[PDB]
């Protein structure tokens, strides 16, 4: 428990990288988060909007 | 300049698909221009078929 300042720095940088990776699963309003899935479902001009 | 049937006129656009757009005349996705059409039944039809 005494080393909490150093463990906190290790924890914060791990949590920031895990959050950055988990944001690849988000849609942001698109039909899918998987990029090849969009390109399989849709025509060229519609896929570009997604 | 070319002649086609009325149902096919709406195939002449950027990003479209259909037999004339597919196999006869393709516009690019970045097209800058205008597509003009007029019915020509009196000029281009013939009795027994043109």
UniProtKB/Swiss-Prot annotation, chain A:
Residues in a coiled coil are 7-50
The superkingdom of the source organism is Viruses
What outcome is documented for mutating residue 12 to H in this protein? In strain: Omicron/BA.1, Omicron/BA.2, Omicron/BA.2.12.1, Omicron/BA.2.75, Omicron/BA.4, Omicron/BA.5, Omicron/BQ.1.1, Omicron/XBB.1.5, Omicron/EG.5.1
State its role: Subunit of the fusion protein that is processed upon entry into the host cell. Mediates fusion of the virion and cellular membranes by functioning as a class I viral fusion protein. Contains a viral fusion peptide that is unmasked after S2 cleavage. This cleavage can occur at the cell membrane by host TMPRSS2 or during endocytosis by host CSTL. In either case, this triggers an extensive and irreversible conformational change that leads to fusion of the viral envelope with the cellular cytoplasmic membrane, releasing viral genomic RNA into the host cell cytoplasm.
Query: Could you tell me what this protein is called?
Result: Spike protein S2'
**Source organism per UniProt:** Severe acute respiratory syndrome coronavirus 2 (2019-nCoV)
Q: Which residues of the full protein are shown?
A: 943 to 992 of 1273
């Amino acid at each position: 428990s005494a080393l909490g300042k150093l463990q906190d720095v290790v924890n914060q940088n791990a949590q920031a990288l895990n959050t950055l990776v988990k944001q690849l699963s988000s849609n942001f309003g698109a039909i899918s988060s998987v990029l090849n899935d969009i390109l399989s479902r849709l025509d060229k001009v519609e896929a570009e909007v997604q | 300049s070319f002649v086609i049937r009325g149902d096919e006129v709406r195939q002449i656009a950027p990003g479209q698909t259909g037999k004339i757009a597919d196999y006869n005349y393709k516009l690019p996705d970045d097209f800058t221009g205008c597509v003009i059409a007029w019915n020509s039944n009196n000029l281009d039809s013939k009795v027994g078929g043109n």
